[PDB]
């Protein structure tokens, strides 16, 4: 077991990419948290990876500053001290910068960028000085590495929390807190999110995307994370790491 | 004149760093607008560099939506079309991650990185598919490409700013706009607002911090912006520009 | 075991980050071809990890290209296919580019370089299209990511194997070779090498150095390299993995 | 005049890229030696730009260890003090890590990888510490952020070129030396090279290739030099410099 004691909050983890993080984490004998705004899908989410011993659903959304105080105490009471956070909740909006409205740009970076702020922020308060082996995972993506011209606003909020993870692990490591935090960086995953767009997975599979010519599977950033979350990545902060079949090398 | 027809908005303009850019554009040849929030430092700043037949100040705050439609009314009013979109206007807090407070966060992310955001998509609707040699200039940091422990929000906006750019440059490449996007990445520079912190500039001066053992001054920043608004850097755009004294090479 | 039925070559495997490397692949079931400049030093480094049937001793220099096809014909002959290449072996030079001989920028390229070319083109010759999860694994460094004054040569290498790997991953993933190409970027490590540089290690250990405040073990360069082994990592090819205790990071 | 009283070497100068290098350094008041193979094309180069009073040819191969004590010597005994190195003397090889001979490995590296360290360290020993504003500017390129598949080789220099010159930086930073390094980084320009190769810039300006839909002019490569060379970028060392059209942006 790599994450033999271990306790961790996935944010966005009942479907796609946190799903599998949540999976592959309890598999490797962590005890988890996964948050969602739906409790019937995240109840069974929950359910489908194993009892309430291993794993539990709490309603959360990640742009809730008030809640994720909220989401501590819970996870903290029936797990034991938390040691690993995955700020993996996020939403995507398909415009260029020029036709990004406010309400859009808004909304995103509310997700995206102040989500991932406050479960950093908190995780550090929370985790620091335990000698927990602390884990703090910002789920970035390719998107903070290169530019879309229809991701505007998602750019902004992936190279946001691509440096600021890196202000983050500075400080922890600077301090002693026993936390690191890092980044990872998934390219084009195959979701449900992905499987309802038309056309997108085989836009994301040409070469000229993927060089791998197919897009990946959950599980592909959920084993990054496993490693990120154990003791293996002791000495990794304020990294990034890339899964990503080669978008990102040419 | 490498800025001859030019027509710049420098938000941030009336001191420092923006200072020095709007006075090396008008010495190129070009019309400036300079926008701050106070008027007797603003009007100041403007008549410093000429008179209002190639500098006018306006009075805008850059996290203002509303505002930046009026800027832009004013300034075409003024001198004809805009060219060039300097976005410079931003704030610091010395604040880790940890002891972000949310007013911290959002108070800062309003002016750097909406700003930003509000300037360089009015920018885009209001100069595309003119012919103009159009250039939006993003003022980013070498704190959007290395973290620094104490400057949490600040990395998170001057990331953000980093790879957006990058998305709006794409676009505007793509759909032929004739509109150039790049960041530029000052390091340390010798400003009023350095000499009020108190042994701020020899902190920046440690070898261990600034290689040359000096930080640089305004006009380090204003000749890089000037090659970025002329023509001669028709073939940049999408790119980073860092001007540090060696800080992030090593 | 996460390596299961991998056959592996790791130069430089003797000592330091490539002995540990070769520790942790046995321990995850892979059979593994150790190489070396010295028998006695080699036979006592593959005898301390395990018997015959899991690893074996090769007195190779790295920069030996002829060498290079008896190794993997050796290894075929003891093990089977080689499924993982770990291009480790490299030397480092203290010494300015000013300060640098013709005879050190060659000797150093011609290891640090060279092998890691010879190793990589030989290994996609011969692990190709046999659905092996086939991983080349290039030993970059921090090195490959910022400058060090007194490190001309070595910097020069080692930025020369992070992109050479790139263009390695990309062919290999554009015509479905089944083989991916990565790098490792290790900060400052604790070897041998390092015990015997009288301050060295108090050196790496400031802050200004390494954010941690020590440097790391040569068990955290290896399990970094067994996540890029195993097939865990599928999805990950051209990209860089960072384990520098924050070094890069600031 | 940006470039009044300068002394420049321009290797690769008789052609293509370092041609406009020179012509726009000349144009820029500086004095100029260009290197080539041969006299007849090179003589003719020089004199097209203008007399002996300006500009010289001089035959030198920039792997040419030797050579380069000469060329230094030449220029300085026609111009005086040599204040500014453009290494831009590179050959293209059309080959996968996979496909490149040895041959073809040494060859490439001998001109773009060790006549950068050549012009680099020689550069250093002669112009520090003389208070010439002196400049060294690497040639690397997009090749040098990104891996492609067919240029194996060339992606090792280029990566190679541009890790080394933030050495040469920070060494010149540190002991006060007044000479600055620094890396541009042409994406495709259209050169009678690439003229040569049927399709090429075709190829090039594919929309996934180069966002813009063209590939740039040998000028636009020539200003950025002349920015890197003046004291306009006296703050500037240890950077990348990337005029791409947007190529590497996605
Ligand atoms: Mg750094
Ligand atoms: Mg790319």
Same sequence: chains 1, 2, 3, 4.
């Avoid at 077991?1 to 944010?11: E, Q």
């Avoid at 794993?55 to 105080?69: C, K, L, M, P, Y």
């Avoid at 690993?84 to 020029?98: D, F, H, L, R, Y």
């Amino acid at each position: 077991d790599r994450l033999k004691g271990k306790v961790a909050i996935v944010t966005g983890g009942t479907l796609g990419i946190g799903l599998a993080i949540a999976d592959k984490f309890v598999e490797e004998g962590a005890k988890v948290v996964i948050t969602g705004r739906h409790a019937d899908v995240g109840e069974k989410a929950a359910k489908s990876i194993g009892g309430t011993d291993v794993i539990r659903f709490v309603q959360h959304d990640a742009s809730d500053e008030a809640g994720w105080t909220k989401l501590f105490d819970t996870t903290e009471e029936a797990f034991g001290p938390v040691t690993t956070v995955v700020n993996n909740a996020g939403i995507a909006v398909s415009k260029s910068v020029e036709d990004t409205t406010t309400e859009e740009w808004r909304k995103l970076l509310s997700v995206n960028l102040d989500g991932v702020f406050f479960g950093t922020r908190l995780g550090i308060q929370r985790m620091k000085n335990k000698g927990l082996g602390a884990s703090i995972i910002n789920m970035s993506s390719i998107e903070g590495f290169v530019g879309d011209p229809t991701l505007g606003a998602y750019n902004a909020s992936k190279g946001a929390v691509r440096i600021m993870s890196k202000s983050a692990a500075l400080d922890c490591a600077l301090k002693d807190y026993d936390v690191r935090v890092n980044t990872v960086h998934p390219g084009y995953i195959k979701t449900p999110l992905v499987d309802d767009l038309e056309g997108a997975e085989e836009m994301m599979s040409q070469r000229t995307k993927t060089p791998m010519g197919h897009i990946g599977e959950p599980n592909d950033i959920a084993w990054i994370c496993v490693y990120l979350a154990s003791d293996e990545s002791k000495f990794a902060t304020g990294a990034e790491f890339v899964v990503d079949g080669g978008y990102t090398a040419q």
